[PDB]
């Protein structure tokens, strides 16, 4: 059992990359904003529909002009687990379980996660902020597994039924209650914040609405693009808020859709709204959930690199000066020359810069044609694939991270984090 994790830290040393200078520790001990966006694709990024853009604001941020690095060809990895899976990966660089979620099944396992390791190293105080109750997908047990010192869940929100769609907390209420939060907390910190009006099945109140449903007559397909308009207008209307209470300039702040909102039920409707039949290498494409990280001190701009979720952990350490070789991780720095161009995905199914791998056939990312002439780097970049899964479910099925002395990381004591019941 020591010689499991011993064979998976080994199988991680080789695509381990040095930092880019220009990157290194640019923000140690800065504050960390987290945003995640729940369901959202980046097929809805200048997107229009009956002439008005659905997103105008993350337009703007997607166009490299505004402090924000853009990463167009980024992937959600993520499986039945959905939000808990990204959360997971972001969280600590492994894929979630090839069925059921990580989150409910493994979460007592022991582990060696980012906001535990930028407590450690800089004195990071993390938290998250979301508008469902603390024990929907098993979070509070996970995360103080995962050493997170804060949870604002739902009693931390006005839940009358004016101020909720859905599951939930509707985020306008929600992003300006959490900004009123962070203002509050001591630097530096690590926040992360979960919406949640973006989710199946897409409705959103008529008073709340302020773009029309488009018309496939798929109610999925028309609602989302309601609750996509109104999820860029409350992410607007925060980063505004955090300009206000000077938690802007000078905050790392990364945003993310976590997974995709429109399955292949809707292929019928998608080949409306998107003037495209959805062919399998298609709904891949469409499998880009987006990344936007503003760094202070840095320009924004447009970076093109193939990447997954599994990469962000790894690139916020080198950002925070932090030596990750340690570290048991699956992902790699973003802005390191070395970052490996390989994107697996739960299934098995892969992208890489030059080609696509979907359901046992590879096509050229070009123009989703099929390829017949296998490329050079095919049989080692499938058996990474395959490898890193399989590496990765080790460590969770093994619980292996019991029997890791890592010299760069104190055991977590669980019982140590208490998320107490807010005053709403
Ligand atoms: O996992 P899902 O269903 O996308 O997200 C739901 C939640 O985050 C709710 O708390
Ligand atoms: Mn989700």
Do not use: C
């Not at 959930?289 to 202070?296: A, D, R, V």
Request: without cysteine; aromatic residues 14%; glycine residues 8%.
């Amino acid at each position: 059992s020591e010689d499991d994790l011993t064979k998976v830290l080994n199988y991680t040393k080789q695509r381990q990359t040095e930092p880019n200078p220009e990157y290194y520790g640019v923000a140690k001990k800065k504050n960390i904003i987290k945003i995640h966006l729940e369901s959202f694709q980046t097929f809805l990024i200048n997107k229009k529909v009956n002439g008005k853009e659905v997103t105008p604001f993350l337009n703007k941020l997607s166009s490299g002009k505004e402090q924000f690095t853009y990463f167009p060809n980024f992937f959600h990895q993520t499986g039945q687990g959905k939000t808990s899976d990204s959360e997971f990966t972001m969280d600590n660089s492994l894929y979630g379980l090839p069925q059921g979620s990580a989150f409910s099944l493994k979460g007592d396992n022991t582990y060696q996660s980012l906001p535990a390791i930028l407590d450690q190293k800089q004195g990071y105080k993390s938290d998250v902020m979301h508008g469902d109750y603390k024990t929907f997908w098993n979070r509070d047990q996970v995360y103080k597994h995962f050493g997170i010192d804060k949870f604002y869940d739902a009693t931390y929100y006005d839940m009358s039924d004016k101020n909720v769609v859905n599951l939930g907390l509707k985020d306008k209420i929600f992003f300006k209650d959490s900004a009123n939060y962070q203002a509050k907390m001591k630097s530096p910190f690590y926040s992360h914040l979960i919406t949640l009006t973006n989710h199946y099945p897409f409705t959103l109140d008529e008073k709340d609405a302020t773009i029309e449903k488009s018309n496939t007559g798929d109610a999925t397909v028309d609602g989302y693009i309601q609750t996509a308009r109104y999820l860029d207008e409350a992410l607007e209307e925060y980063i505004n808020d955090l300009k206000k209470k000077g938690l802007y300039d000078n905050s790392v702040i990364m945003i993310y859709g976590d997974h995709y909102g429109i399955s292949e039920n809707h292929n019928n409707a998608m080949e409306k709204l998107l003037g495209e039949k959805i062919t399998p290498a298609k709904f891949t494409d469409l499998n880009r959930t987006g990344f936007w990280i503003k760094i202070p001190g840095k320009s924004g701009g447009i970076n093109n690199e193939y990447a997954g979720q599994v990469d962000v952990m790894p690139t916020i350490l080198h950002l925070a000066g932090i030596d990750t070789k340690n570290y048991l991780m699956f992902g790699t720095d973003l802005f390191s020359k070395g970052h490996n161009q390989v994107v697996p995905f739960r299934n098995g199914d892969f992208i890489t810069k030059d080609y696509k791998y979907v359901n046992g056939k590879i096509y050229s990312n070009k123009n989703n044609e099929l390829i017949t002439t296998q490329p050079a780097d095919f049989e080692k970049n499938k058996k990474q694939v395959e490898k890193d899964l399989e590496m990765s479910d080790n460590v969770l099925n093994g619980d292996l991270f019991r029997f890791y002395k890592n010299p760069d990381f104190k055991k977590v004591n669980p019982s140590k984090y208490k998320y107490e019941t807010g005053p709403k």
